[PDB]
Structures are given as C-alpha cells and as structure tokens.
Prior knowledge:
By secondary structure, the protein is an all-alpha fold. The protein is built from 7 helices and no strands.
Amino acid sequence: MTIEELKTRLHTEQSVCKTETGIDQQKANDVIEGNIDVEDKKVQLYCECILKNFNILDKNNVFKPQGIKAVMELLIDENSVKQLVSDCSTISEENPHLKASKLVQCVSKYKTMKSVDFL
Ligand SMILES: CC(C)=CCC/C(C)=C\C#N
C-alpha cells in the first residue's frame, strides 16, 4: 500500500466514520490531529469506527495488534512499530469505547492521521 493510497484510505474512513457517528467536524479534526478527548462519546465512536474499518478491532472489539503493525510499518521504522505495539496493545481499560479512543490516542503519539498527509 503506497503512502498516497494510505492517505486516500484514511480520508475515506474519516468520511464514512464521521457520517456513521455524527461527530462534529471540529472533533474529528482534533482526533485526526492527534488530540483525542478520550471521554467524549462521539470521539470514542469515531475512533472505534476507524479502527474497525481497518480491521484492527473486530466487530466484537477484539483488538488485533497485527493490523496496527501492517499500517504503521508504512510510516515508521520496524523497531518503533514493535515499540508502539508493546506500548499500546494492553491499555488498562475495560470499557470498549474508552479503549478505542485510548488506542487511537496511543497510536497517535507515533504518527497522527493528519501527519500522514504531509508525506
Ligand atoms: C490505521 C488506523 C486504524 C489508525 C489511524 C492511523 C494513524 C497513522 C494514527 C492513528 N490512530
């Protein structure tokens, strides 16, 4: 998957997830820029939607670390991806919606969705 294809795919998922969740554009922008209000319900739903559409969460919110690895190895070096996966794969959160926002927050420390557009 080329960087240009990932840019495009991200825009597409951002669009469909905005529509699915009804999130304000401002809040979607915040998430895209890596500023995740983890407690905000529609932020959670938006994060969840993007993760599910990339198959990183399955339909029952089972987290799939390999899905993160597949996308992030396009963006950062292999060892950093391993570090990201270790850093982000066992967030201490029982509520699947808060887990989804926390997951996007953690991944976004490494690369934000917005930052992919500059590549
Ligand atoms: C690939 C998916 C599901 C996550 C968004 C992509 C990026 C680069 C940061 C985050 N969160």
